[PDB]
Amino acid sequence: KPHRYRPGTVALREIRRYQKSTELLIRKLPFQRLVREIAQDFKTDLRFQSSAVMALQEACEAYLVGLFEDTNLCAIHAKRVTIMPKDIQLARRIRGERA
Amino acid sequence: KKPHRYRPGTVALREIRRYQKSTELLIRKLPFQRLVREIAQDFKTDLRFQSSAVMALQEACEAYLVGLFEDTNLCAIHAKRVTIMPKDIQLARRIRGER
Amino acid sequence: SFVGLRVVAKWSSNGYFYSGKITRDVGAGKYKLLFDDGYECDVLGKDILLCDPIPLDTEVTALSEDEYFSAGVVKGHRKESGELYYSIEKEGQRKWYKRMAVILSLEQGNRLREQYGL
Amino acid sequence: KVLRDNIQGITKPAIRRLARRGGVKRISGLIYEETRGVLKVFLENVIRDAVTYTEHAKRKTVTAMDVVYALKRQGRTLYGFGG
Amino acid sequence: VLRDNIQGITKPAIRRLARRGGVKRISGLIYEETRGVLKVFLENVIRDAVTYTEHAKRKTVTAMDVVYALKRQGRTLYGFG
Amino acid sequence: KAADISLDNLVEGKRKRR
Amino acid sequence: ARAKACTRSSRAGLQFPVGRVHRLLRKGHYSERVGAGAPVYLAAVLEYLTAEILELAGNAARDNKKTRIIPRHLQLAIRNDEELNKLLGGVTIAQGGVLPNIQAVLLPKKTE
Amino acid sequence: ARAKACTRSSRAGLQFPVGRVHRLLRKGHYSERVGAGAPVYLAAVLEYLTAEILELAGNAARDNKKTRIIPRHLQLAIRNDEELNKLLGGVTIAQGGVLPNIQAVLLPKKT
Amino acid sequence: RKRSRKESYSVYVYKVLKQVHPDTGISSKAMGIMNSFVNDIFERIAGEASRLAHYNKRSTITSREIQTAVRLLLPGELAKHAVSEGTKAVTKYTSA
Amino acid sequence: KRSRKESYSVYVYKVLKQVHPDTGISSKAMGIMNSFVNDIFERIAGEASRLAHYNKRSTITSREIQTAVRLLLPGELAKHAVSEGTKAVTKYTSA
Amino acid sequence: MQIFVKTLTGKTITLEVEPSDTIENVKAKIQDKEGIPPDQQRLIFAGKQLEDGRTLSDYNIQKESTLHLVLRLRG
DNA sequence: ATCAGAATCCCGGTGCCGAGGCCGCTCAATTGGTCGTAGACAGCTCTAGCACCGCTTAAACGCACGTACGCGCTGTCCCCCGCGTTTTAACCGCCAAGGGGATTACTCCCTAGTCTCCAGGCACGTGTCAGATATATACATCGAT
DNA sequence: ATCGATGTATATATCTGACACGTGCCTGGAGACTAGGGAGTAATCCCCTTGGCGGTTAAAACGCGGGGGACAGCGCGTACGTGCGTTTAAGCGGTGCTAGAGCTGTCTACGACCAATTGAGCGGCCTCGGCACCGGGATTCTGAT
């Protein structure tokens, strides 16, 4: 029988590893496609500076990390460890991003 | 028994329905004015307050408290419960970023 | 400034001096007092007047029913079975009032702060 | 007396009125102590800025304009007292 | 260029992002609206930046045009300004 | 203290606070 | 020999003082120079912005059988639109009240 | 007139360009007139704020046995001093990362 | 002594009610709220147009600097309507 | 090539050498400080510009800069910033 | 007179100059205790400058009154 | 499903006070003219954004498994709620006093503006070492036989 | 529980490209000098605030019975963490190109500024109708039945 870590420890290892790192977490190229497709709805043939895309991504991780660290508070408030979408729109509701 | 008692909760619903149509001030006037003039003593002694200034301070505070409580309802219902405990206010303020 | 001193001190901003007792030291010159009205909190050291009993030539405020700024001078320290009453003399007429029901005001306490401020 | 507690002036029924404006069924007994603390924090944060505005104006009265100004500085703008 | 590419934000990417925020256990239903929230954030920010470029008579989107777009949203970046 | 700019309220030592 | 002084608001067909907007813009420290049509544009925009609020307030007052606009009507008009909410998310109205809402869970549940 | 044109930053004993702040205030469209002491006062508070962040950033960098302050150290300094956290609550730092924090309920339990 | 004039938008808002509801009225307490609403909104676009003047290193605020400022502030449906009203008024002005 | 770009780069080094005579700043952190200085400067300048009209005055003096700092910098950072402001202005007035 | 002079860093220096003296002997008592030339120091009380020949009793100076020493840096 | 029985709503009457209209007037808005310069425009340069291609391997992805967890149920039990009775301080109305906000008049020192000289800071360049990288390893911690 | 094994921080060699610095210079900052006005100060005033008193009474406070929500414990099955082998596509380098950003010279129309003026807009006055209020009946949930 090979070694098998109990479910819930590799997750802690990953949390401790990504809370020390600073590199971007989502791949750059598929994010560039997403940004250009979102921008496609406003004008056609729009060009983007590379720094202009890095700033957008750097904002995106900054937003989602902040959203998740509130989602955790919502989840433990419900006496849970799993996070669920209802936590997401409750954290968004309280912030005021939707209502 | 012989006296007519309502089931608990329905009077609360009736009061909610009444107070959500009303527009008059809810916090008592004179004790709030006393509180305001007590707090101001910590920054400078012997202040004077316009009548309109105290009214503005009072009704802004009521709006803030009402927003806080409507957030705490969402927090409490998210925990599959109705009663509000002090943890709900702390969670609501933590998510807003006030703490 | 040890435990057992009946000192008179304020308890808030521009407050009036109240006679209590040194029961514990919070720290950084914050001497707690046990007031005679159920109030107990932290009082900073320099806002405390060390007097037991209060000197004869100290002007105080006599307290009775509905009295706020009755100005008088203690002209007698009489022990009534351990309860010492202050003899308040105003306009040549002397009246006795309880140690509990006295106040040392700001102007009257500024004559002592330089001496008993501790 | 002198500088009473005076925060009990926010009475227990008054807090329930505010809660039931927000649509609350039940209040646990511990809400009243926390609400007074939150309310006091809010008053401190607003009156500080109002007092600073008055002091910069070299005045002694705290006008309603200064309160509106302090609340606008925090993003909680009022409507109607301005002017 | 009409491909979705909203699946370009792959499942392990949301996993890493949540684990940065301190999330132990993630339900499988998160990924279908964590992409939607992110999308909404984008058509807000690009909607602002494109208008900034419009007023600038430009055809390219500069990093300043995104920094000022986030400034109006109260989410100021530091480093590109 | 909140008046003509200052000459008295200058400073204590450095504000370490961890 | 002017012989006529037509108000600029009439030239623009508006009921707000485009003449005032010069004074507010120039004395408001936004730029050294201000364009000719900039105050006209602001006046026109302010016309429409107040026009919607007054349109909705009258309707919110008619159902209350009152011909005078109470601030309660103004807040009901603002908070029932999803657009003026985005405009005035952080705005609190004097004597406004709260939109009447009770969540379904708090509703009483007989359900026979 | 001439000479030696003593610099105003040196007159105030500061390190920031007091001369620049006039040019950044007069052309900043903030008022008709700018007082003489206003730029000097700004150059003091800006210098103090920069020096306070750098004092903590250097300490943070020393804790990693590095000599150059990388943006990671900057946000580690900002998000630790709560009185600066209040100042920069709505500010995101590029490549800054996040403070490491774990809720006690999430931590493993062996009891 | 001599009293100072306090300029407000009280007169002009009445002209809009008569445009909208020629029979309804407004209370003074509610009237000030609308008076402050114009001032608050005016400061946003007027303030916003100030940066856009700088962002292109320009020194003037023309109608174009406000069209874009409106699209930044007014969300969606209101923006495309206020722009139409703004352009309609300017077009009338330039012909006179 | 003649387009000159102003920044606070030289001053951030020069203030650093006092607080830390040995460390250094990467270009990314220098860019972060460049934005920080501009952010705080604009915040305080906007507050002062309002305060001028807020009291119907038309000059920006040090008095409202002292006042503006007390509105933005929280807690005792305000006390230390006003300390530095008065300390600097008094020396300037002496000369 | 027992008056202490404050500095811009936090250094207290008492000076024994009676309330009816001028400022020449005050500054001389500054030099003989610290050694700072007249060009490199000035005295400010209550925000206003101090004239070198002006008497101390004209500014109603009382016991244990604070005074501020500004270092005038030329160079 | 069905009644007492409170709670809420609507018709009518009453009265009062504030909103709307009028009048007089101070002053900001309009008009007309001059003028300086901000920017619209044409032109030129040259940078980087875009596109493509090829190689690599890190990373995504589908799958299988099993266990920790979300959830529903139940039981207890306390703790808010509704209600009544008692207490109290809020609220309204009124009266006097004077602190200070607001105003006007007056003066003058401070600051914008202009011109001239000069050095502080930026663009560019260049040497070098701080740190990322690769690799061997003692360590701890995880989890089980 | 002690041992195994995995991740990890450990120490060391090293090679580079980003950082610190040296230099040219030029454009922005400093120094004088002038004129004009915004701001500081003195004096007045009346308005708004503070305080104090008296009377009703709505609201607050205290006590109690209880029922309904909170909370703890237990069973379950299912959805998710984890490891592995397979596969897609990110990532890096190098290349070629030109659309478009960016800088520069021109001039012209657009806006600041100033004087005369007049009518739009503000302050004070006044009146009546829309709203507040009180009683009385009709109507709608509500809970024990």
- The DSSP H or E segment spanning B18 is helix B10-19
Nearest CA in chain G to I76: G83
Q: How far is CA E69 from CA C26, E72, E81, H87, in A?
A: 52, 5, 12, 21
Q: How far is CA H33 from CA D57, G29, J85, J90, in A?
A: 19, 11, 20, 21
- CA distance linking residue A47 with residue J91, whole number of Å: 52
- CA distance linking residue I60 with residue G43, whole number of Å: 18
- The DSSP H or E segment spanning J10 is helix J9-19
Instruction: Say if I34 falls within a structural domain.
Output: yes
Beta bridge partners of K4: K14
- CA distance linking residue I59 with residue I38, whole number of Å: 25
Among G33, G32, G34, G44, residue whose Cα is nearest residue G8: G44
Q: How far is CA A48 from CA A55, E72, I10, I55, K53, in A?
A: 11, 20, 48, 18, 71
| Nearest CB to A95 within list B75, B87, B95 | B95
User: Is E46 in Cβ contact with A38 (below 8 Å)?
Assistant: yes
Instruction: Say if J2 falls within a structural domain.
Output: no
Residues contacting A61, CB < 8 A, separation 6+: A24, A25, A26, E17, E20
- CA distance linking residue G96 with residue D78, whole number of Å: 11
Among I54, D6, C86, residue whose Cα is nearest residue B30: D6
Q: How far is CA G7 from CA G19, G37, G110, I6, in A?
A: 8, 15, 67, 21
Is the Cβ–Cβ distance between H41 and J70 less than 8 Å? no
Residue C61: both structure tokens together: 């405020």
Is the Cβ–Cβ distance between G25 and G38 less than 8 Å? yes
- CA distance linking residue J90 with residue A20, whole number of Å: 45
Through-space separation of residue A4 CA and nucleotide M83 C1' in angstroms: 8
Is the Cβ–Cβ distance between K23 and K57 less than 8 Å? no
Residues contacting E49, CB < 8 A, separation 6+: A52, E61, E65, E66, E69
**Assigned superfamily of B10-96:** Histone, subunit A (1.10.20.10)
Q: What are phi and psi of A2, to 5 degrees?
A: -70, 160
DSSP C88: E
Among D37, D50, D42, residue whose Cα is nearest residue D10: D37
| G9: amino acid identity, one letter | S
Instruction: Say if J32 falls within a structural domain.
Output: yes
- CA distance linking residue B56 with residue D81, whole number of Å: 7
- The DSSP H or E segment spanning A47 is strand A47-48
Q: Does residue D23 belong to the interface with chain G, where contact is any CB pair within 8 Å?
A: yes
Domains of chain H: 8-106 (1.10.20.10)
**Assigned superfamily of A9-95:** Histone, subunit A (1.10.20.10)
* Chain K environment of J94 (Cβ under 8 Å): 42, 44, 70, 72
> Which bases of chain M are under 7 A from a protein CB atom?
5-8, 18-21, 27-33, 38-40, 45-46, 48-50, 59-61, 66-71, 79-84, 89-91, 99-104, 110-112, 118-124, 130-132, 142-144
CATH of domain K2-71: 3.10.20.90
Among G72, B73, G105, residue whose Cα is nearest residue D19: B73
Apex J42 CA angle, J39 and J45, nearest 5? 145
Beta bridge partners of H34: J60
Query: How do the domains of chain A map onto residue ranges?
Result: 9-95
* Chain H environment of F18 (Cβ under 8 Å): 80-81
DSSP K70: E
Q: What are phi and psi of I29, to 5 degrees?
A: -60, -45
DSSP E4-20: --STTS-HHHHHHHHHH
| I15: amino acid identity, one letter | K
- CA distance linking residue J37 with residue G90, whole number of Å: 28
Domains of chain E: 7-80 (1.10.20.10)
CB pairs under 8 A between H and J: 168
Beta bridge partners of I61: G34
Q: What are phi and psi of A83, to 5 degrees?
A: -105, 145
| E1: amino acid identity, one letter | V
Residues contacting I11, CB < 8 A, separation 6+: none
- The DSSP H or E segment spanning G34 is strand G33-34
Chains B and G touch (3+ CB pairs under 8 A): yes
Name the burial class of residue I66, with classes exposed (0-12), middle (13-18) and buried (19+) by CB atoms within 10 angstroms of its CB: buried
Q: Which residue has the tokens 């705005």?
A: G91
Chains C and B touch (3+ CB pairs under 8 A): yes
Residue H43: both structure tokens together: 């150059």
Q: Is the dihedral of CA C95, C99, C102, C106 positive or negative?
A: positive
Is the Cβ–Cβ distance between I49 and I62 less than 8 Å? no
- CA distance linking residue B29 with residue D38, whole number of Å: 19
Is the Cβ–Cβ distance between K50 and K22 less than 8 Å? no
User: Is A33 in Cβ contact with E5 (below 8 Å)?
Assistant: yes
Residue K5: both structure tokens together: 């002079």
| J46: amino acid identity, one letter | G
Query: Strands, DSSP E only, in chain D?
Result: 61-62, 77-79
Q: How many residues does chain B have?
A: 99
- CA distance linking residue I13 with residue I27, whole number of Å: 12
Is the Cβ–Cβ distance between H48 and H70 less than 8 Å? no
Q: What are phi and psi of C26, to 5 degrees?
A: -65, -45
DSSP K53-65: T--GGGGT--TT-
- CA distance linking residue C6 with residue C2, whole number of Å: 10
DSSP C20-81: --EEEE-SSSBEEEE-TTS-EE--BGGGEE--SSPPTT-EEEE--TT-S-EEEEEEEEEEET
Residue D48: both structure tokens together: 């500080």
Q: Does residue G76 belong to the interface with chain I, where contact is any CB pair within 8 Å?
A: no
- CA distance linking residue H86 with residue J74, whole number of Å: 7
- Give how many domains chain J has, as a whole number: 1
Name the burial class of residue G45, with classes exposed (0-12), middle (13-18) and buried (19+) by CB atoms within 10 angstroms of its CB: buried
Residues contacting E66, CB < 8 A, separation 6+: A52, A55, A56, A59, E45, E49, E77, E80
Among D23, G60, G109, G107, residue whose Cα is nearest residue B17: D23
Edge-to-edge strands, sheet with K67-70: K13-15, K3-6, K67-70, K42-45, K48-49
> Which bases of chain L are under 7 A from a protein CB atom?
5-8, 18-21, 27-32, 38-40, 48-50, 59-61, 66-71, 79-84, 89-91, 99-104, 110-113, 117-124, 130-132, 142-145
Nucleotide nearest to E27 (CA to C1'): M80
**Is strand L in 7 Å reach of the CB of I15?**
no
Q: Does residue E51 belong to the interface with chain I, where contact is any CB pair within 8 Å?
A: yes
Nearest CA in chain H to F15: H52
User: Is K42 in Cβ contact with J94 (below 8 Å)?
Assistant: yes
- CA distance linking residue D61 with residue D73, whole number of Å: 20
Edge-to-edge strands, sheet with C93-98: C93-98, C83-90, C70-80, C59-62, C102-103
Measured from the Cβ of residue B49, the count of other Cβ atoms closer than 10 Å reads: 20
Nearest CA in chain H to A21: H97
DSSP K40: G
| G31: amino acid identity, one letter | S
Q: How far is CA G4 from CA B57, G1, G7, in A?
A: 50, 8, 10
Q: Chain B: nearest CA to C13, how far in angstroms?
A: 7
Q: Extract long-range pairs of I32-35: CB within 8 Å, 24+ residues apart.
A: I32/D80, I32/D81, I32/D82, I32/D83, I32/G94, I33/D79, I33/D80, I33/G71, I33/G74, I33/G93, I33/G94, I34/G50, I34/G53, I34/G54, I34/G74, I34/I9, I35/D82, I35/D83, I35/I8, I35/I9, I35/I10
| C19: amino acid identity, one letter | S
- CA distance linking residue E9 with residue K73, whole number of Å: 61
Rg over alpha carbons for chain K, rounded to the nearest Å, is: 11
Name the burial class of residue K35, with classes exposed (0-12), middle (13-18) and buried (19+) by CB atoms within 10 angstroms of its CB: exposed
- CA distance linking residue C20 with residue C9, whole number of Å: 8
- CA distance linking residue H58 with residue D64, whole number of Å: 46
Among A37, A41, A39, A94, residue whose Cα is nearest residue A71: A94
Rg over alpha carbons for chain E, rounded to the nearest Å, is: 16
- CA distance linking residue C20 with residue D25, whole number of Å: 46
Is the Cβ–Cβ distance between H73 and H64 less than 8 Å? yes
Q: Does residue E56 belong to the interface with chain I, where contact is any CB pair within 8 Å?
A: yes
Domain extent for J13: 8-94
| Chain B contacts to A (CB-CB under 8 A) | 71, 74-75, 78-80, 87, 91-92, 94-96
Residues contacting E59, CB < 8 A, separation 6+: A45, A46, A47, E53
Nucleotide nearest to J16 (CA to C1'): M20
Nearest CA in chain E to J28: E79
User: Is H83 in Cβ contact with F17 (below 8 Å)?
Assistant: yes
Is the Cβ–Cβ distance between E50 and A39 less than 8 Å? yes
Is the Cβ–Cβ distance between B69 and A94 less than 8 Å? no
Among H72, H67, H74, H26, residue whose Cα is nearest residue H53: H74
| Nearest CB to H24 within list J11, J41, J65 | J41
Neighbors of chain B with 3 or more C-beta pairs under 8 Å: A, C, D, G
* Chain J environment of D57 (Cβ under 8 Å): 55
Query: How do the domains of chain K map onto residue ranges?
Result: 2-71
3-state secondary structure of D27: strand
Residue G107: both structure tokens together: 């509703």
Name the burial class of residue B10, with classes exposed (0-12), middle (13-18) and buried (19+) by CB atoms within 10 angstroms of its CB: exposed
SS3 sequence of G78-111: HHHCCCHHHHCCCEEECCCCCCCCCCCCCCCCCC
CATH number at residue J78: 1.10.20.10
Residues contacting K53, CB < 8 A, separation 6+: K22, K23, K24
Q: Does residue K44 belong to the interface with chain F, where contact is any CB pair within 8 Å?
A: yes
Helices (H) and strands (E) in chain D, counts: 3, 2
User: Is B56 in Cβ contact with D67 (below 8 Å)?
Assistant: yes
Rg over alpha carbons for chain H, rounded to the nearest Å, is: 21
Nearest CA in chain B to C13: B42
Resolution in A: 3.4
Q: Extract long-range pairs of B91-98: CB within 8 Å, 24+ residues apart.
A: B91/A73, B91/A74, B91/A77, B92/A94, B92/B68, B93/B68, B93/D38, B94/A70, B94/A73, B95/A70, B95/A73, B95/A74, B95/A91, B95/A94, B95/A95, B95/B71, B96/A94, B96/A95, B96/B71, B97/H89
SS3 sequence of B25-61: CCCCHHHHHHHHHHHHCCCCCCCEECHHHHHHHHHHH
Q: How far apart are the first and last CA of chain C?
A: 8
